[PDB]
Scaffold this active site. Structure first.
Site, PDB file in Angstrom:
ATOM      1  CD  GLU A 278      -3.091  -0.807   0.086  1.00 36.06           C
ATOM      2  OE1 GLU A 278      -3.004   0.180  -0.682  1.00 36.06           O
ATOM      3  OE2 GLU A 278      -3.997  -1.660  -0.025  1.00 36.06           O
TER       4      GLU A 278
ATOM      5  CG  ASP B 167     -13.809   6.904  -5.172  1.00 35.60           C
ATOM      6  OD1 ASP B 167     -12.751   7.517  -4.904  1.00 35.60           O
ATOM      7  OD2 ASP B 167     -14.352   6.106  -4.367  1.00 35.60           O
TER       8      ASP B 167
ATOM      9  CG  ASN C 103     -11.003   5.840   0.111  1.00 33.34           C
ATOM     10  OD1 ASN C 103     -12.206   6.099   0.093  1.00 33.34           O
ATOM     11  ND2 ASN C 103     -10.191   6.157  -0.876  1.00 33.34           N
TER      12      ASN C 103
ATOM     13  CG  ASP D 293      -6.544   4.865  -0.888  1.00 36.12           C
ATOM     14  OD1 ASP D 293      -7.720   5.046  -0.522  1.00 36.12           O
ATOM     15  OD2 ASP D 293      -6.203   4.018  -1.749  1.00 36.12           O
TER      16      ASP D 293
ATOM     17  CB  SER E 277     -12.048   8.796  -1.949  1.00 37.91           C
ATOM     18  OG  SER E 277     -11.654   7.603  -2.596  1.00 37.91           O
TER      19      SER E 277
ATOM     20  CG  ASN F 150      -8.661   6.025  -3.996  1.00 38.54           C
ATOM     21  OD1 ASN F 150      -9.071   6.221  -2.847  1.00 38.54           O
ATOM     22  ND2 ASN F 150      -7.533   5.378  -4.249  1.00 38.54           N
TER      23      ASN F 150
END
Ligand SMILES: [Cl-]
Ligand SMILES: [Cl-]
Ligand code: NA
Length: 129
Positions: free
Chosen positions: A35, A48, A59, A52, A50, A46
Site C-alpha cells: 500500500e 472516485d 480511504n 488513500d 477519494s 482514487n
C-alpha cells in the site's frame, strides 16, 4: 516516516494487530509494503475522487475526513492527515475498524491481489519480535 520492515512489524504487534480478526502480523506488514512501501506520508488519489492516506492507505470516502470527498463518511472520526503521522496509532485504530467491517482484509485491494494466500510470514523473517 519510512519504517523499516521489522520496525513496522514491532510497532504493529505492540498495537495489537498480530492475529487481529485472525490476520497474522505478516499479513499486515505485507499490506503496508504494497500500500505505502512503509511510508507513513504516502497519499494516493482514487478514481472516485477519494484519497488513500498513510501506511495502510485508508480511504477518505468512508473512514477519515479530508474535506474534499463528497458524500463521504468519517467512520474512524479522524482527519485524514492524522493517518500520515510518524506515530501509527491512528492508522492502526482505524484499520481495526476497517478489517472488522465484514470482508476482512479484502478491504485492501493490494492485500487481496498481492498478499492473500502468499507466504506472508516471510515479511517478519529475521525480526526480533
Ligand atoms: Cl505471519
Ligand atoms: Cl476474515
Ligand atoms: Na470522508
Amino acid at each position: 516516516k519510512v519504517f523499516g520492515r521489522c520496525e513496522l512489524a514491532a510497532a504493529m504487534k505492540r498495537h495489537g494487530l498480530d492475529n487481529y480478526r485472525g490476520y497474522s502480523l505478516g499479513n499486515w506488514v505485507c499490506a503496508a509494503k504494497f500500500e505505502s512501501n512503509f511510508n507513513t506520508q504516502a497519499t494516493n488519489r482514487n478514481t472516485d475522487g477519494s484519497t488513500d492516506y498513510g501506511i495502510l492507505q485508508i480511504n477518505s470516502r468512508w473512514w477519515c475526513n479530508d474535506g474534499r470527498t463528497p458524500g463521504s463518511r468519517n467512520l474512524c472520526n479522524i482527519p485524514c492527515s492524522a493517518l500520515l503521522s510518524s506515530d501509527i496509532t491512528a492508522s492502526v485504530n482505524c484499520a481495526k475498524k476497517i478489517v472488522s467491517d465484514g470482508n476482512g482484509m479484502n478491504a485492501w485491494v493490494a492485500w487481496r491481489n498481492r498478499c492473500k494466500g502468499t507466504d506472508v510470514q516471510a515479511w517478519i523473517r529475521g525480526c526480533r519480535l
